[PDB]
Design an enzyme around this catalytic site. Structure first.
Site: not given
Lengths: 305, 393
Positions: A49, A102-103, A216, A258
């Protein structure tokens, strides 16, 4: 050097953003939210596109194009797992200043191949992957974080998690403290930006008077942080640093959500992380519910209120 | 993910790594007829479960030990009888251990020399790394402690590839003399490529060694696969049984949910992993015993709050529930509603404690307290924890 691109992390009202993966069901939602908040979102790539208009805004087939064409200085990726790393490299190619992936789900082997490169060029700086992004409250937001919960202010925030960070930010504003710059570095084991990367930035930011560090189980990024602060934050003008580390009750050998959140081969537990940061002057909140009240008191002791 | 030993040796074999000849068995008779069919001096019969510890573990047939050596095809049989069907517990499994459905009947081998060799991506190195000690046989973490100098490393360049000199440098440090050396090293090279080929976070060989007959063999080896690379390792994941995975854990995955059980009576469920860990922690800090860890991701959706609760329903060790959801991306009353819809609709009978935070929190709390249900709204994460705890004393 890669070190030399840390500065690109400090996004602001001047920064112009393009979203790689623009027409996707994800790049859609966040672009409407990024513009609303008030971010310089100029357009977005999406092969095929590459010439139309999405959301009252231009579309390109590639990153390299849309850069020049829109001038833009930051790229955020919402590209699915299998391709997401390609996108990072397509961004490092066109020498983009700040790349925010972000993935979630990118193969760890992919990311080691990515950092191979990324640690050679100095034009690009990557936050991520598997991260909510970065936010300079009031000035610029690149990521999936709820903006309205941030108040421009004095605390620099760096975290490996998403919503836990939201807790902290909410907790800071409610005591009225606000944030200077928040950086979610992500929950993956191999990533483009770590804690120390951010702490350098906060330690030299005049706007930053305090720091909250959220970690963490898994890896050693926390221990390197504690090392760095011992070295660059001791002495007559150190900034207070408050921290919480999750996973004290995590069982070993398991992936706590995570990918990087796993205690393996006897390495990665919270207790050792907490003990190290303490050794570096870091006041560690025991309850994650008390990060606002904890850093509040620190400011009050040093009479910085 | 992890595969059964017989599946990972297969795999190592097909990618040119030398391992013991072996047979897999579903019955005590196939096992016994397998030890005869091998035909060799000695035999190793090893139960198949993913948890390490088999050696010193204990079966529920009464049989002590998940690993056994005997030259007589018969001992195999009698020992098999006591494994297929029973459960094996080890210093690494739930107190009642895993059930066993297959055994491996492989040909023992004389281990001349025992070394340690492993390959992974190192968290401080960025890029592959070879970790090997000439002192194999024992649990690496102990050598590392008692004799840090017997642990050699060779960083490898992910773009370049492993270098011949490195494999030689390692082979050498590992104890291989002259001839043997070039064969050791080629096995190393073959493992490293296996490793990158399969998207392993780790390929561990212990012991890696030599037979008196002159061969370089990986007699034992553990392999951890990167769960993210599954979409490009369908063959390998096809072999993943899921037989061994905990039930609730299995169900939970169908709905993108990520569950992990703890031994407590206060369940909980949060959106985001970091915050789900912090939730289990705050409960405990305040005296509770978290029942599990549940992460819904950033995907709140009436559907899930339902499956999420559905699951909790399972573990009948649960006496209470704490819901920590930080809204941000959505109105907190919609979440409160779906909570309650899912709650009556799931005829619950355990005290619920909800802490919602985000947008329109006040009306959202109204719904929870004005539901008739045995729900309780909480002010913040600490208030949430204190209550849940009180709620079960």
């Amino acid at each position: 050097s890669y070190t030399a691109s840390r500065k690109h992390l400090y996004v602001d009202k001047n920064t112009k953003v393009i979203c790689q993966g623009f027409t996707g069901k994800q790049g859609t939602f966040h672009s409407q939210q990024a513009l609303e908040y008030g971010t310089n979102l100029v357009g977005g790539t999406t092969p095929g596109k590459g010439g139309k208009t999405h959301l009252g805004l231009p579309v390109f087939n590639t990153v390299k194009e849309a850069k020049e064409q829109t001038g833009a200085t930051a790229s955020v990726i919402y590209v699915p797992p299998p391709f997401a790393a390609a996108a990072i490299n397509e961004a490092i190619d066109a020498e983009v200043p700040l790349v925010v992936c972000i993935t979630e789900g990118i193969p760890q082997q992919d990311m080691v191949r990515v950092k191979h490169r990324l640690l050679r060029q100095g034009k690009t700086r990557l936050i991520g992957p598997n991260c909510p992004g970065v936010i300079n409250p009031g000035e610029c937001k690149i990521g999936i974080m709820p903006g309205h919960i941030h108040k421009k202010g004095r605390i620099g925030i760096v975290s490996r998690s998403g919503t836990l960070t939201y807790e902290a930010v909410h907790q800071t504003t409610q005591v009225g403290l606000g944030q200077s710059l928040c950086v979610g570095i992500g929950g993956d084991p191999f990533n483009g930006t770590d804690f120390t990367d951010c702490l350098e930035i906060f330690l030299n930011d005049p706007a930053t008077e305090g720091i909250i560090l959220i970690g963490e189980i898994g890896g050693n990024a926390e221990e390197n942080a504690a090392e760095f602060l011992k070295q660059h934050n001791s002495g007559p003008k150190s900034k207070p640093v408050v921290s919480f580390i999750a996973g004290l009750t995590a069982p070993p050998g398991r992936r706590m959500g995570h990918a990087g959140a796993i205690i393996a081969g006897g390495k990665g537990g919270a207790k050792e992380k907490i003990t190290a940061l303490q050794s570096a002057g870091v006041v560690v909140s025991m309850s994650p519910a008390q990060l606002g009240t904890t850093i509040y008191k620190e400011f009050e002791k040093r009479k910085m209120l | 993910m992890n595969l059964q030993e017989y599946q990972s040796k297969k795999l190592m074999s097909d990618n040119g790594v030398k391992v013991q000849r072996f047979f897999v068995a579903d019955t005590a008779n196939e096992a016994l007829e397998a030890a005869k069919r091998l035909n060799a001096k000695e035999i190793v019969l090893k139960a198949q479960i993913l948890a390490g510890g088999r050696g010193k573990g204990v079966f529920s047939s009464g049989l002590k030990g998940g690993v056994h050596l005997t030259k007589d095809p018969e001992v195999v049989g009698q020992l098999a009888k006591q494994m297929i069907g029973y459960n094996l517990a080890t210093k690494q499994t739930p107190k009642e251990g895993v059930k066993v459905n297959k055994v491996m009947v492989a040909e023992a081998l004389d281990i001349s020399r025992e070394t340690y060799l492993a390959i992974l991506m190192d968290r401080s190195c960025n890029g592959p790394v070879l970790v090997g000690s000439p002192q194999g046989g024992v649990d690496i973490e102990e050598v590392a402690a008692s004799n840090p100098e017997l642990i050699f490393k060779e960083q490898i360049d992910i773009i370049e590839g492993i270098k011949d000199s490195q494999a030689q440098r390692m082979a050498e440090n590992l104890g291989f003399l002259g001839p043997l050396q070039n064969q050791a090293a080629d096995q190393i090279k073959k493992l490293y490529n296996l490793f990158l080929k399969i998207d392993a976070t780790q390929v561990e060989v212990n012991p890696f060694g030599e037979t008196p007959e002159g061969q370089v063999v990986c007699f034992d080896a553990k392999i951890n696969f990167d769960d993210n690379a599954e979409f490009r390792q369908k063959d390998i994941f096809a072999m993943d049984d899921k037989s061994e995975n905990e039930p609730i854990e299995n169900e939970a995955a169908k709905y993108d949910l990520k569950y992990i059980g703890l031994d407590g009576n206060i369940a909980c469920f949060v959106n985001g992993a970091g915050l789900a860990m912090a939730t289990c922690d705050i409960i405990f800090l305040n005296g509770g015993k978290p029942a599990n860890f549940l992460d819904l991701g950033g995907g709140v959706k009436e559907s899930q709050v339902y499956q999420a609760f559905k699951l909790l329903t399972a573990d009948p060790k649960v006496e209470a529930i704490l819901v920590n959801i930080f809204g941000g991306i959505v109105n907190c009353a919609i979440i409160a509603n779906g909570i309650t819809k899912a709650c009556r609709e799931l005829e619950l009978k355990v005290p619920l404690v909800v802490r919602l935070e985000g947008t329109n929190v006040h009306e959202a709390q109204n719904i929870l307290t004005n539901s008739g249900l045995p729900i309780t709204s909480a002010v913040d994460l600490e208030d949430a924890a204190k209550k849940a705890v009180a709620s079960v004393t």
